[PDB]
């Protein structure tokens, strides 16, 4: 056929749009940019890998010099 | 029932929280208040037997002059064994329906109940029992009335 | 302690009580005019209330 049906949302203000409207549609429309992240498996690997360090896990190279 | 003596045991039998040795004597109509024998009524149109009010027996499982409340089902039956101490066995008969053959067959079950010294029960009699809290391994009912003999 | 040198800690702890008493009176006084200024500022709001 030649007819098409969809859904529409009309907002009072553009700021009200960004306050309640979901992000992925914003990416669809181009208003907002996409978020860059690593894959789900790599993120999962990192989180459990940091469970083996105790205190200030951000830098852990101080134990590399123990062997001399 | 037939009991020769009331105090024939190692310990002393008495109703709990019934004060019996007061210097001043006061006469009151209330059963338990004045210091004399205490008793209650179960309900459901069941009348307290006359022998209970003036009897001297001590029992903590009788629905009258006892600490047991009656709630649940009420059943009726025929006594088949009453030759042990303060407990009887009744026999109940019913009909089970087999759907395929469109006819019935007889079945039966055995039940254990506690009998108070107020009643006198002999073999082959109708009794009415009521549910109560677990009193033993296999005793959960108490006799309330003995129907007249044919 | 690292923040304060040994000379500082001894002198600070050993400040004379009479000097401390003067210090208290000095400290209280500026707060007292500042509180009076608080009533003067409240008068400033009172003037604003009169104006509108």
């Amino acid at each position: 056929g030649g007819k098409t049906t969809g859904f529409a949302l009309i907002y009072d203000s553009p700021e009200a749009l960004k306050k309640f409207e979901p992000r992925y549609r914003l990416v669809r429309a181009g208003l907002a940019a996409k978020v860059e992240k690593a894959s789900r498996q790599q993120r999962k690997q990192r989180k459990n890998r940091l469970k083996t360090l105790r205190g200030t896990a951000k830098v852990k190279g101080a134990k590399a010099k123990k062997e001399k | 029932a037939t009991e020769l003596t009331v105090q024939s045991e190692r310990a002393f039998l008495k109703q709990p929280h019934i004060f019996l040795n007061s210097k001043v004597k006061v006469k009151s109509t209330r059963p338990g208040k004045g210091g004399r024998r205490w008793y209650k009524d179960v309900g459901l149109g069941f009348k307290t037997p006359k022998t209970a009010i003036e009897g001297h027996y001590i029992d903590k499982k009788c629905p009258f002059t006892g600490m047991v409340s009656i709630r649940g089902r009420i059943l009726t039956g025929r006594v088949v064994s009453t030759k042990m101490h303060r407990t009887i066995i009744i026999r109940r008969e019913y009909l089970h329906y087999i759907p395929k053959y469109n006819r019935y067959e007889k079945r039966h079950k055995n039940l254990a109940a506690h009998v108070s010294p107020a009643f006198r029960v002999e073999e082959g009699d109708m009794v009415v029992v009521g549910q109560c809290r677990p009193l033993s391994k296999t005793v959960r009912f108490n006799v309330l009335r003995v129907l007249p003999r044919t | 302690i690292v923040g304060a040198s040994l000379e500082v800690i001894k002198e600070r702890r050993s400040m004379r009580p009479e000097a401390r008493n003067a210090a208290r009176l000095a400290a209280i006084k500026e707060s007292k005019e500042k509180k009076a200024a608080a009533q003067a500022a409240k008068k400033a709001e009172k003037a604003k209330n009169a104006a509108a």
């Binding site: 309640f20 979901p22 | 309900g43 459901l44 149109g45 | -």
Partner: protein
């Protein structure tokens, strides 16, 4: 099973929630509260599935975080809050109030109410006795406890609650000739007049009612909710709960259709 449950499977939810068997595997699982789990009206289902104000779950939970919706004059912020019979839900921004009441088919329906009448409730009393210190009190069906009540008030009656001060303005006795609505059983939505009551010693009595159209029905006392003697205090919904049979239901449906167009 090693503790209490916290998940509820779809296809096991109460029927009167009217949830589709497709589009997901789980259900809202209403949280604990003042109303029974079996017959309650979760706030998320009411806001999203009936009023159609919120499209899905994500903004549905946002709505309560903005504190826009309140029940009984007090704001609630949990999506699975158990609402129930006679409770009043108020949305000020749009400007209307709702009361949850069964329809004649046994499910909750939307019912506009006026603002002046939407500021009080009424509920059946469950137990009355004196508490600690000798102070008498009673508790109704919606977990409302009130101290120092009228001594003549007994159990199974109904009492009118102000909902702002919680004071006992008025009450209705439970006797023959009163107007009642059924709350449990297969007889969902019916309204009738008490004809006579028959009691059975040992529990589980039955009461006989009579409808305005000379219909007859009976129900347990635990399912009767008296709402007036005559001229019921609350405003009944459309149809007044008369339970027309299917023959006239189809006759009226075609009559109304032809009448409109």
């Amino acid at each position: 099973a090693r503790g209490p449950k916290k998940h509820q499977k779809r296809l096991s939810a109460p029927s009167h929630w009217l949830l589709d068997k497709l589009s997901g595997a789980y259900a809202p699982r209403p949280s604990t509260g003042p109303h029974k789990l079996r017959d309650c009206m979760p706030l998320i289902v009411f806001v999203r599935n009936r009023l159609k104000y919120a499209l899905n779950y994500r903004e549905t939970k946002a709505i309560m975080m903005q504190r826009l919706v309140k029940v009984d004059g007090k704001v609630r912020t949990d999506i699975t809050y158990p609402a129930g019979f006679m409770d009043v839900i108020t949305i000020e921004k749009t400007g209307e109030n709702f009361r949850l009441i069964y329809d004649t088919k046994g499910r909750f329906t939307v019912h506009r109410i006026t603002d002046e009448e939407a500021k009080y409730k009424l509920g059946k009393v469950k137990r009355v006795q004196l508490g600690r210190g000798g102070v008498p009190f009673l508790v109704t069906h919606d977990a409302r406890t009130i101290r120092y009540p009228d001594p003549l008030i007994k159990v199974n009656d109904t009492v009118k609650i102000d909902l702002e001060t919680g004071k006992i303005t008025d009450f209705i006795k439970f006797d023959t000739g009163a107007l009642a609505m059924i709350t449990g059983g297969r007889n969902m939505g019916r309204v009738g007049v008490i004809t006579h009551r028959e009691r059975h010693d040992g529990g589980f009595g039955i009461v006989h009612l009579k409808d305005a159209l000379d219909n007859t029905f009976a129900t347990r006392e635990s399912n009767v909710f008296v709402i007036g003697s005559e001229k019921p205090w609350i405003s009944l919904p459309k149809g007044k709960g008369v339970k027309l049979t299917i023959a006239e239901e189809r006759d009226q449906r075609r009559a109304r259709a032809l009448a409109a167009a």
